[PDB]
């Protein structure tokens, strides 16, 4: 027949056995998808230059090793 409807009794004690796992830092999972798109397309233009600068810097770090 009738029983107990709703209770919040054990739950806060259950929630702290494996802890309240805290928030994760702001350098993990900082995806910019869904952000304002004119500034998202601009930043892609810049990262495609920063990658070929990184390809050129490492290639320039090798010729500064084969000569020394």
């Amino acid at each position: 027949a009738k029983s107990k409807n709703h209770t919040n009794h054990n739950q806060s004690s259950k929630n702290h056995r494996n802890g309240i796992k805290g928030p994760m830092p702001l350098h993990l999972h900082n995806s910019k998808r869904g952000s304002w798109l004119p500034a998202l397309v601009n930043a892609r233009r810049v990262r495609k230059h920063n990658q070929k600068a990184a390809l050129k810097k490492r290639r320039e770090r090798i010729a500064a090793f084969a000569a020394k």
Partner: protein, 197 residues
């Protein structure tokens, strides 16, 4: 009488012995448990602890992967030094997709019949861990590698696959069976391919 509430949850699972039945892994565990305590080298610590590990946790490496990371270290090596001895605790497989490779010296726990041939045909050498305990007994001038665990089928099935964000694969023997409701936007909903965090 002590209030040790979250003290069993601080415990971890270590397993100092091996589950393997191989009598030649047990000889390397006889050798590298000796070297792990009797030497301050962190090589023999890691080589002993990775030798205990299971066959799933000793994922194999490919020969074209050894040939690329040894290249990217021999770029900034002075050419008076030779090269490290590549050591993997696991299996080296051949790579069809990389024909010519340098003369590198590889110590693995097992080689293929074809990964052994393409190493020695390039001027190289396949070693073993009793033979690595004699030349560099502490791991001086080595390069310890693992082999890739992502990309496995089992890792690609790990997940819910119908909560948002999850791109895991369903356990389905039929490929064209689970493709309709909850997987197309026309069939009442489609699970969101992206979720923040």
């Amino acid at each position: 009488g002590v209030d040790l509430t979250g003290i069993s949850k601080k415990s971890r699972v270590i397993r100092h012995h091996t589950y393997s039945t191989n009598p030649y892994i047990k000889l390397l565990i006889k050798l590298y448990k000796f070297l792990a305590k009797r030497t301050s080298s962190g090589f023999n610590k890691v080589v002993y602890q990775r030798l205990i590990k299971s066959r799933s946790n000793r994922a194999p490496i490919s020969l074209s992967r050894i040939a690329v990371v040894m290249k990217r270290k021999a770029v900034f090596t002075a050419k008076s030094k030779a090269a490290p001895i590549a050591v993997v605790v696991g299996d080296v497989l051949d790579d069809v997709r990389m024909a010519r490779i340098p003369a590198m010296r590889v110590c693995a726990l097992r080689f293929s019949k074809s990964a052994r041939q393409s190493i020695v045909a390039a001027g190289g050498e396949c070693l073993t861990f009793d033979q690595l305990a004699m030349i560099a007994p502490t791991g001086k001038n080595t390069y310890l590698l693992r082999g890739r665990k992502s990309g496995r089928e089992s890792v690609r099935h790990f997940g819910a696959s119908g909560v948002p964000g999850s791109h895991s694969k369903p356990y389905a023997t039929n490929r064209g069976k689970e493709t309709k409701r909850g997987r197309r936007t026309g069939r009442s909903y489609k699970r969101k391919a992206f979720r923040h965090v």
